[PDB]
């Protein structure tokens, strides 16, 4: 996250880290056994880390649970990034508490201008080497679909929205992939892509979760 602020320990209790030795993607806890992340975060040997604040230091609220299943959306298109969503099942249910909590799925799509919380342990600078430790947060509005298409002509699908700022310096960034965009207490987005990060006139592009609720429910039920 570039141009954001320190969240505070466990103030984003649905934020998880996908780990393979080291953190490599974010994700969102949607019930005690399931995490939502990006299809492009798919790889074998994932451990989910819940209750993290400082990702480098044990603070006492962590749960470390192996993934048992990783289910990429069956229409994920790695060429266009359409349908960039994955579900991960935990090998055992997480213990839910004030610091480890699920986030609700949306009941409708959010409108342009809706303010959202984006979070993660990604790079905090738009160029060069970052040294993140604690979870970072950014408040960012959903942009109009027309301004989104204007920023990325010929590249925005109906399963994406832009969120953030046109002026630069405030955005999600590398290492934030798969993490949450939450608006009014609902998970509306997944950190996906952009032209670099925090660049002028190139806001972040996010998977539009509201289009996947039935697929999410079906995948949970059948697995």
């Amino acid at each position: 996250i570039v141009g954001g602020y320190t969240c505070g320990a466990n103030t984003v209790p649905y934020q998880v880290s996908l780990n393979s030795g080291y953190h490599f993607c974010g994700g969102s806890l949607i019930n005690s056994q399931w995490v939502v992340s990006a299809a492009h975060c798919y790889k074998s040997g994932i451990q989910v880390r819940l209750g993290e604040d400082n990702i480098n230091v044990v603070e006492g609220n962590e749960q470390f649970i192996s993934a048992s299943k990783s289910i990429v959306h069956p229409s994920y298109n790695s060429n266009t990034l359409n349908n960039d969503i994955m579900l991960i099942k935990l090998k055992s249910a997480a213990s839910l508490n004030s610091r480890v909590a699920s986030i609700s799925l949306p009941t409708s799509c959010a409108s342009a201008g809706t303010q959202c919380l984006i979070s993660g342990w990604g790079n905090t600078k738009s160029s060069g080497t970052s040294y993140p430790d604690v979870l970072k947060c950014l408040k960012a509005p959903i942009l109009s679909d027309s301004s989104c298409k204007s920023a990325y002509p010929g590249q925005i699908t109906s399963n994406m929205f832009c969120a953030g700022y046109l002026e630069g310096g405030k955005d999600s960034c590398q290492g934030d992939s798969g993490g949450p965009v939450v608006c009014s207490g609902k998970l509306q987005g997944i950190v996906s892509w952009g032209s670099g990060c925090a660049q002028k006139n190139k806001p972040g592009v996010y998977t539009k979760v509201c289009n996947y609720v039935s697929w999410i429910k079906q995948t949970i039920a059948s697995n």
Binding site: H23, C41, K43, N123, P132, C173, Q174, G175, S177, S195
Partner: protein, 34 residues
């Protein structure tokens, strides 16, 4: 070690990757092996 194009970690050492470089992807918000 992970092949070129594999996902890797901005927190991890260069030896994550066979190529010895784990770099930010230009588009996706992950790091990948050079």
């Amino acid at each position: 070690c992970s092949p070129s194009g594999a996902i890797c970690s901005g927190f991890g050492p260069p030896e994550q990757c066979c190529s010895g470089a784990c770099v930010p992807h230009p588009i996706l918000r992950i790091f990948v092996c050079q």
